[model samples]
Target: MRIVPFGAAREVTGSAHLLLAGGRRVLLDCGMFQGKEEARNHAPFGFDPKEVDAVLLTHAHLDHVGRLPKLFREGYRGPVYATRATVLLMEIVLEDALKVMDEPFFGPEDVEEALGHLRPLEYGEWLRLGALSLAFGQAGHLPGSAFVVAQGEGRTLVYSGDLGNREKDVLPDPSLPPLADLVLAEGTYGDRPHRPYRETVREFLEILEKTLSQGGKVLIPTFAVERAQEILYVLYTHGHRLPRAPIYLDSPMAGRVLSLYPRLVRYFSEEVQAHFLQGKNPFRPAGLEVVEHTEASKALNRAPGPMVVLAGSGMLAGGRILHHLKHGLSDPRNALVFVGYQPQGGLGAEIIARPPAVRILGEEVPLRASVHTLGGFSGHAGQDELLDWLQGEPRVVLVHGEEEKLLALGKLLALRGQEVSLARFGEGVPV
Candidate 1:
């Protein structure tokens, strides 16, 4: 068997890989690159798309499944295999990705064409197409996130699809390994453990309350997937302590995702499931207003002060959040809170690093507002948690991390009596 990573190798974006066995070609997570890595998207895919027999999607995040429409434009007509929950969420995310792109490779018709190839499967159901056999299990990253297991030619391999860390009540913890000859693990948070989740939330609320009390507003740049919902859940149950203010959800895709969550309540964690069984809504934040059209979003500037605004494109690459930042960053009363990792070269990272100013939409703005990063809300597993997931590591290969962090995990794994190797972008290795 031959394994290759096209993206999320030695970096966190563009999560794609190639799996070849017995004359069959399968693509794993044909994702788009983001932030500083976005330049790579303008280059060639480095592989023949039409030769791919199938695409195995791990989840609906843009970094995991964003580039599917591009593959469709290249004439790859194979089915996209994912869980049913992922199918519902995938449509929303793909449409949002296209909405944000000014010169996108494809359009709505292409997204519809891609959705036509969606093949939703049960959690443990195995499907075989020629030399490849595939199954998916809960990855615990989000509502529809999954880890994939592939078998062909008497060898087994696994792909860790953005597995979850701790204190996430939205989905169950990930499943243990199932005897793989080769393991493709994610090291997103492989270098350190996050502060206690409650502690992070407490500090977030403290900063929020302090800002709101003094007539300052909070501008929270969020990822539209699980992170947005996680923040909403926290506020829904604990937001009454703060002064009553307008809560704005500015991501159009997030509104669609919020509506879809109730129908799939059975997939949630046990406590959340039991809450719904008792006729309780765990995601209903008070007075949550979703700004849909662009005009209404612009009107937010005129809205009252001391409001909590949640917008997408969490890394500050692009989206409604940039506009909010353009207005909010120059004000000392406003606070910028980040709920996800701020990768290098993204605006979020530069701002969190305490740079004096950053360029937004071709204009430079001073950073007078305070910046806060809530680390415990990450959807990726931390170092200890990742180590716990890799049971009796079998020829471990680490992907989905920065160069320094990847090396850090490699050293730890070597001490545990496992042979580990790091994968570089567009690099191929035999297993």
Candidate 2:
């Protein structure tokens, strides 16, 4: 079998890989490139679009599944397999992507075409694709994120699509890999281990307490999918200790996702479920307010102090978070906390770099708000967790991170007597 790295090779985002087996081509994750202008402009694979057989999605993160519409527009006719939650999240994420993309590239018809080809697959259910048998295990990154295992020609290839090791109140831990011949894994946090989860939470609370003491609002720029929900859960269980501030959830999509929490309770741990069953819904705390309409979102600026606003477009690239940042970021008392990874060229990354001024809505605004990043909340596994997940020695292919991080991980794995390969865009290998 031939494995080809199409998108996320040396850099992060736009994850696409091709597996050619038994004269059939199976694509893994036709994701979108998510960085600066030049990187995003890199075109899709040069292979004939029609020749691609099928797509197996690893998760619903935009970087993992954002390019599906482009593939559909390019006349690729194939089934996209994923777990039920992944399928649901893909629909939501793709719709959001289309809403935000530059006009001439995508349109309504493209979204419809892509959705028409979705094929839902349950976890642990093996499906035969030509000579390859495929199975999915929980990835623990998001609600339905999965790691795919494909077996063919006396070899088993496992793809850890954005693996997460930290256990959260709302999501289950990832499944450990059964021995495989080849392992393709993400190296997002391979350079360093995350700070202890409790320590990060304590620091976050300290920041929140300080801001609330000054009667200032705390603006949290969050990813609407899992991050926002995770943050809300944390606050709900611990908000009483911090001053009794009104919490506002300002993203419409996030509100919709929050509505689904009731049905997804089973995914959480027993302790977390008990917290909800005892009449305390994290997503709907008594102090929590949902801002649905545009006017309501705008009204947040007029409201009084000591409130916590959770808004989306996690990287502060777009969405309601920009509006909040424009109004609140200049205030000394207000704090802007980033709860997700900020890729290069994104507005969040620019702000995090401590630039003197950032452009928003065509105007340059001063960034006076204190910036904080909660690294412990990252959904991807750190270096130590990644090593532990690869229990049995397997040929490792590392992708989905900066070049330095990937190389560092490669060296660490080499010390363990495992053949490690760092994937670069367009590189291919035979297994």
Per-model C-alpha lDDT, please?
0.84, 0.81
On lDDT, the candidate that comes out on top is: 1
Task: Give the alpha carbon lDDT tens digit for every residue of 18-53 in model 1.
Answer: 988878888989888876667676667889999998
Candidate 1: segments with Cα more than 4 A from true spot? 355-368, 425-427
User: Which tens-of-lDDT digit does each residue in 1-431 have in candidate 2?
Assistant: 87888877878878888888877888889888764632463465656668888899988888888778878888998898988777887788888777766643567798899888999887799989888898998787887788888899988888888888564546778889868888888898878877777887888889999998899999998878778888888887777788988888898778877887777665565676787788767666558877888898888876768999999778776778788888887788899887777776678778889988888877888888898988787888888888888767569998888889988888889988999998867777777
- If scored against the real structure, what TM-score would every candidate get? 0.93, 0.92
Candidate 2 displacement at residue 349 in angstroms: 4.7
Cα deviation in Å at residue 69, candidate 1? 1.7
TM-score of 2: 0.92
Residue 51: error of model 1 in Å? 2.5
Residue 270 in model 2: shift from native, Å?
4.4
The 10 consecutive residues of candidate 1 with the worst lDDT sum are 35-44
